[PDB]
Design an enzyme around this catalytic site. Structure first.
Site, PDB file in Angstrom:
ATOM      1  N   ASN A 135      31.976 -30.115 -14.006  1.00  8.68           N
ATOM      2  CA  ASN A 135      31.396 -28.537 -14.221  1.00  8.68           C
ATOM      3  C   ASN A 135      31.009 -28.234 -12.738  1.00  8.68           C
ATOM      4  O   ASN A 135      30.692 -29.128 -11.804  1.00  8.68           O
ATOM      5  CB  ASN A 135      30.055 -28.604 -15.148  1.00  8.68           C
ATOM      6  N   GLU A 142      17.250 -39.221 -16.710  1.00  9.31           N
ATOM      7  CA  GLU A 142      17.959 -38.028 -16.480  1.00  9.31           C
ATOM      8  C   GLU A 142      18.146 -37.770 -15.060  1.00  9.31           C
ATOM      9  O   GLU A 142      17.258 -38.115 -14.325  1.00  9.31           O
ATOM     10  CB  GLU A 142      17.377 -36.863 -17.101  1.00  9.31           C
ATOM     11  N   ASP A 143      19.343 -37.739 -14.454  1.00  8.95           N
ATOM     12  CA  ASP A 143      19.785 -37.286 -13.215  1.00  8.95           C
ATOM     13  C   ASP A 143      19.226 -38.234 -12.041  1.00  8.95           C
ATOM     14  O   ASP A 143      18.728 -37.978 -11.034  1.00  8.95           O
ATOM     15  CB  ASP A 143      19.480 -36.166 -13.001  1.00  8.95           C
ATOM     16  N   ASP A 203      21.047 -40.392 -20.853  1.00 11.17           N
ATOM     17  CA  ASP A 203      21.827 -39.255 -21.347  1.00 11.17           C
ATOM     18  C   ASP A 203      23.054 -39.332 -20.324  1.00 11.17           C
ATOM     19  O   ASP A 203      24.200 -38.946 -21.173  1.00 11.17           O
ATOM     20  CB  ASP A 203      21.186 -37.748 -21.362  1.00 11.17           C
ATOM     21  N   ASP A 204      23.051 -39.322 -19.380  1.00 13.18           N
ATOM     22  CA  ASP A 204      24.272 -39.034 -18.170  1.00 13.18           C
ATOM     23  C   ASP A 204      25.269 -40.000 -18.489  1.00 13.18           C
ATOM     24  O   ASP A 204      26.492 -39.641 -18.398  1.00 13.18           O
ATOM     25  CB  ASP A 204      23.779 -39.074 -16.626  1.00 13.18           C
ATOM     26  N   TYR A 218      19.246 -24.247 -19.823  1.00 18.94           N
ATOM     27  CA  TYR A 218      19.756 -25.612 -19.387  1.00 18.94           C
ATOM     28  C   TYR A 218      20.922 -25.199 -18.777  1.00 18.94           C
ATOM     29  O   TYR A 218      21.251 -24.213 -18.192  1.00 18.94           O
ATOM     30  CB  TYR A 218      20.097 -26.347 -20.669  1.00 18.94           C
ATOM     31  N   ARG A 222      19.905 -37.224  -8.118  1.00 18.17           N
ATOM     32  CA  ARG A 222      21.246 -36.722  -8.665  1.00 18.17           C
ATOM     33  C   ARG A 222      21.450 -35.837  -9.521  1.00 18.17           C
ATOM     34  O   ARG A 222      21.648 -36.377 -10.576  1.00 18.17           O
ATOM     35  CB  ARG A 222      21.859 -37.916  -8.808  1.00 18.17           C
ATOM     36  N   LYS A 259      16.086 -29.536 -20.589  1.00 17.00           N
ATOM     37  CA  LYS A 259      16.466 -30.331 -21.584  1.00 17.00           C
ATOM     38  C   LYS A 259      15.668 -30.645 -23.011  1.00 17.00           C
ATOM     39  O   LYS A 259      16.071 -30.680 -24.077  1.00 17.00           O
ATOM     40  CB  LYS A 259      16.921 -31.614 -21.197  1.00 17.00           C
TER      41      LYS A 259
END
Lengths: 562, 563, 563
Positions: C401, C238-239, C261-262, C95, C148, C166
């Protein structure tokens, strides 16, 4: 609708997918079976025509039974299509009374196995046995141990014909998906000496295991079945002996989605016949005095549901009970009599002991006389005369099967009562014309009126327990389908050819009620309950199994080459 | 023996692997089918006891046929075990004459398809139709187009019952592996209006395609089959129309491993009966004068093979021909007559025309009278009387079928000839007792004596071509199996119940001869030809299908771990 | 446990059943694969010893990623056994951040496909694309459209690596059954011209579809998935791009079992870190003043969840809102400012506009400073200096990050604040030693603390809706797992190597609460909730797949024969 990865020869060996000559050329080529079939292409209607022509050329119902069983094991859709083409005609072939004869011959004519066999010696491994069944989604199970096949006794493993036949009607009459249906036999041995001696007997050549060893075996089966198929999986007991039938039902009915058709199913159809009958007598259920010949599973089930119907009229239990009398082989059930069970004692009224049924009718002077003890000719000439004197319109139910075991014929009943009798039976009788020129058409108290619609309703809405109220309400729905015209003709039940519509309306009431009183588990709740049930009903139409082909815009469909 | 990857429910649906209740508990558990079967375990003989008991409760040979076909489509081993348990009983149920009635009702009673259907509309694509068949190894094909089902006419696509039935005998009588057998029907249409108006007809609802369209279609069939299954794959034609049967045979017999049973098979069995009869007349075949009633596929085939047998004795071709006479519906076959063909003219001797069979007999005064025209009672009291006068032991073959189409009965033949006639038939007659105490057991000229053994022999040694000499030699082998005792009992053929061993000894000869004459393609050459053939013969015993389990030394079997 | 009908070669090709050398001899023989494998038998730990040894010989995290993906596609059990053997080591390989680099090279390095690809051109047919997936029981789906990918931008169909990665953690950290997990990519196009000109690009070579065509396409996806796999099937976004992520979440969260989740995952983990920090500041959350650097999916999600936590204490909605301040690329978020959105305006307080982050800090004088805008070094020496003056223990979350995008390092944060700062990050920093002898171990705010446990909890009790309260309660559970000792060591999160047990205790709470609050749909209700969850957790031990063998009494097991 459908998708499948199965191809070629093996596909034709899968009765759920196999269409025989109903396969189009396109289909045959795409599935890699072109050449394995004659170069003709039949509609389903032509397929039925062929089956029926073979059917009518046979000379016994048994040979007819074998034909239709072969067909089921070859082409499932065509099988049910045939059944539904003339349900009145084909029901008594795939189910009672013909299936009973098949069970008697089951070890001899055993060929293509159906259903799942689970023995006492598989104790502690039932789960592994379930995994041999090639369907992972099961919503309905019929199970028997073969100790009391109706009117034939203990046939052991040969009783497997019963669940198979019954489930055929789950599907044919109720639209249950047969792939989601599982016939099961529990072989713990048998007390049939003829089968113990028959070298062709397909079952365990041993006596029946009793006691705790048997009880624990059944417990494991309930656990195994619900663990694998889910607590929503319906589990119907069939043709167990009197004692184990009631014991198992009370033990499991408040933790599993289970019921016993012999007891509860028969009860519902019998009550339905009464409510319909009250519309002729134009009195109420409380005005009735019910005499049962027989105090077995059916009799006690009916009597119990009659009591609950009386409570629904407001009449309390202790008073409702007093209107119901039962008789068995030892005599009338009365207070303080020897050889009585728990379930019988609750109808044991204080009364002089009696043995002869003729005398009992004359003493009790009942309004409704219900036979289920399979004593052929029990309603003798004197019984019927007496009944016709004690009541204006005596209610006479001769529900014992087959005809040879019927308490009385329709002709015999109308003749002697001179046309005033309100009659129904379990075996079919031809209509009867009276000297007044009036014609009566007595109906059949067939259990098929009940279990298909109930099972569809319970499974559809995800009902987790089956209460006696389901069967009482089901009885009301059936009686509601009877027109005053039908009553004037002497019919107490809906016409058999409408059985699918009855089953639907039964299941609708269950679904509607279940979401009303919040007993349903399937969500979200559907806007339209009628359409919701239909959506889950099996169709006899062939499903498409070819893959859905569709194109993309050529620009993104093209093969890249740089 | 064999190891299969098939498991669970689908395995029970495979008739090649399915043992039903013969599956032991271990097998059921290991094969993931425990629970799908009742909790009893039967030996193979018990399974037989169940089938035969069902069998005996049936009231017609047709229902009997249906029961056995169901069994075949369920459990192949048990089917053949039942068949071989009383071959004489079950042969006439799965093959002629019952299979004929089945073909008539085939569209009505159609259920579980067997074999492969190929149509003129699959022209150019036959190779792909072949790929639908789940067996890739094929050593024997039987094909028909259904135009001339013997005695029954044009049954079109309903003729599929014949190849299927015949191959059941390939296996049952000859030990051919059924998984390596392929029944084929070629549907080019039918001239049977009765099927063309039957809404249940399973075949193409059109007239038969003729000419170059048909000829080219057969050419592709032979190409596709030989390409896929190899040139060593045996291709037997059955129940084709008269003209096509001969044309295709002469066109393919030199290039493909092929033969026509109606012509070459019947010829072999007929000649075998004659060779047997010679040991009663105690003269040679060159002393005989043969009269045929019939001039179709069977008669001409038999006639052709007699000449070969005569040529083998020492005669040329021309002299041997003059010992054979043919009669058809238009009368005696002689030089000059109208309505002649290619093969008929080959036997058209210079002689005045004749039509009446009695007169024809009286003129020619034949030693052997053979009937294959399906005309019941053609051998009248007068004909039998004449034959018994011209000859001490007149040879009478009434080979037509069924009994109702038999030229004469064994009862009337022996009686009128005063027990001196040497008699054989195609249909079975019960023994006849003579006034002199003797009882005669007339034999039956079944084609099943021939094709199973030949097919086994041809395939086992990889013979590429099937010559007439294979059939002559086969006929010799068959006659050699008849004891002197059987001949004095009036039998010209061995007991049908020994058909298994007859097929073996036939296959043996073919193999032995092929390796010696250098025509075999299977190598290395086996030292024992007898044992070689037996090793190729299908057994009705259940095969092992569990995986081979065996341990290794504990040292190298153990699971290695962190140490 | 389970019984499979798959056999032979094809069985070795199934990564769910294939054990490689862990197959014993008995298994190999019974499964018809003996000979397909070398004659050695390894325990699971030996297999691990082989993989890790290969693993260590690699010179890049990318090659390491490839090795493990190969393993996953070969032997699922061994894959997860390796993963769980050192979860802290292998998590950042399968991940984030390595999976991000994999997504960049995804079209180049594409080999064994994982998961399911669904495109806007499959509109109206999504239900049929689903049927291509060989598992019929799905309990957890992770879906992205690749617009994204965090920190990496629009990678289009190359984003498939994220769901796959994930879900590896769903299983590895949460005990989700991988056979019941489904990675999905929705390819509607990409705005990445770099992929649009790459001849190796595996996705659609077109611009992204927007508007109602896209909205309607997502509506079908949710319908098809819920229909096939049931409404209880968990669907995690996600994303997705900022606007879509919020729109879809509010549109589906009440009807479908779904969460992003983001937004919600990051919120839970951020709040957990704060709750932990409170046990160091020894004050309550209502005493705090929060300043966010960033106003995207993560920031707004965290901000929303802090309000819920405040509401739980006793405050209304309005007062709690004023304790939170947001900053984006255009500066401080206040009432009246241009370029605002729906969720941003919800935090737009009446205040003069500001842009400079130092000045914003100086004005607001916050207790907690949280960064999620991926702007390296945003927390300057001055900002850290100010925070350490306004507060005794300033809370500093540099959650961005990777390290190169971290608002500050643990080294410079602790140093400048003189060891008084309470510090957490999204990227991992090594321990820092203070001049006073103490060593501080700054923890990591991984999303992996949250989504595995939640997903396990939701699914095990059949929860139909995922409320904000699930995430708040989860955040409490996570903080409760931090000991007083760990806080004095400077850790705001439990050790990553205990992630398994953290996920368990999270799932426990959810289940316990759901049965008590009557929101669970799984029945009967278990007596022991702890044991219930453990029973649902995936094990890395090899399953038995041989058939259950067991004997019966000899009397009824025996083969019956003629007697």
């Amino acid at each position: 609708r459908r998708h499948t990865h199965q191809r070629g020869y093996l596909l034709t060996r899968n009765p759920h997918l196999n269409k025989d000559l109903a396969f189009t050329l396109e289909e045959r080529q795409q599935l890699n079976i072109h050449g394995l079939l004659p170069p003709s292409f039949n509609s389903q209607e032509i397929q039925v025509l062929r089956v029926v022509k073979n059917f009518e050329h046979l000379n016994s119902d048994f040979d007819r039974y074998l034909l239709l069983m072969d067909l089921q094991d070859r082409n499932e859709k065509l099988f049910y299509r045939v059944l539904t083409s003339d349900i009145e005609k084909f029901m008594p072939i795939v189910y009672t009374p013909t299936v009973g004869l098949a069970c008697q011959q089951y070890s001899l004519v055993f060929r293509k196995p159906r259903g799942l066999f689970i023995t006492i010696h598989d104790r502690g491994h039932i789960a592994s046995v379930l995994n041999a069944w090639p369907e992972d989604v099961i919503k309905a199970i019929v199970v028997t141990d073969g100790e009391r096949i109706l009117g034939l006794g203990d046939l052991g493993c040969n009783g497997m014909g019963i669940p198979v036949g019954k489930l055929a009607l789950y599907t044919a009459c109720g639209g249950m998906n047969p792939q989601e249906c599982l016939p099961v036999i529990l072989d713990v041995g048998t007390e049939n000496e003829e089968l113990l001696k028959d070298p062709l007997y397909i079952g365990l050549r041993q006596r029946r295991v009793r006691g705790s060893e048997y009880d624990d075996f059944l417990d494991e089966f309930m656990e195994a079945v619900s663990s694998k198929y889910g607590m929503n999986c319906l589990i119907q007991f069939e043709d167990f002996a009197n004692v184990n039938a009631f014991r198992l039902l009370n033990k499991y009915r408040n933790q599993y989605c289970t019921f016993n058709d012999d007891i509860q199913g028969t009860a519902s159809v019998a009550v339905a016949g009464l409510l319909a009958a009250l519309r002729i007598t134009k009195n109420k259920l409380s005005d009735q005095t019910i005499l049962f010949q027989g105090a077995g599973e059916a009799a006690l089930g009916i009597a119990h549901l009659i009591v609950m119907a009386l409570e629904k009229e407001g009449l309390p239990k202790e008073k409702a009970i007093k209107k119901i009398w039962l008789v068995d082989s030892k005599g009338l059930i009365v207070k303080g009599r020897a050889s009585l069970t728990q379930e019988k004692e609750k109808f044991a009224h204080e009364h002089e002991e009696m043995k002869n049924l003729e005398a009992i009718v004359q003493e009790i002077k009942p309004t409704a006389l219900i036979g289920v003890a399979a004593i052929g000719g029990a309603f003798s000439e004197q019984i019927l005369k007496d009944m016709a004197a004690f009541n204006e319109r005596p209610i006479i139910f001769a529900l014992s099967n087959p005809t040879s075991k019927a308490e009385c014929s329709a002709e015999q009943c109308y003749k002697i009562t001179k046309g005033r009798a309100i009659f129904a039976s379990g075996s079919p009788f031809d209509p009867v014309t009276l000297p007044n020129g009036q014609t009566l058409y007595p109906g059949q108290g067939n259990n098929s009126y009940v279990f298909p619609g109930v099972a569809l309703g319970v499974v559809a809405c995800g009902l987790r327990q089956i209460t006696d109220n389901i069967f009482l309400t089901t009885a009301e729905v059936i009686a509601q389908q009877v027109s005053d015209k039908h009553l004037e003709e002497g019919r107490l039940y809906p016409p058999l050819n409408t059985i699918r519509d009855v089953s639907l309306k039964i299941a609708e009431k269950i679904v509607k009620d279940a979401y009303q009183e919040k007993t349903a588990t399937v969500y979200p709740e559907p806007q339209n309950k009628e359409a919701f049930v239909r959506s889950q009903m099996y169709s006899t139409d062939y499903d498409q199994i070819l893959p859905d082909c569709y194109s993309w815009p050529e620009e993104v469909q093209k093969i890249q080459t740089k």
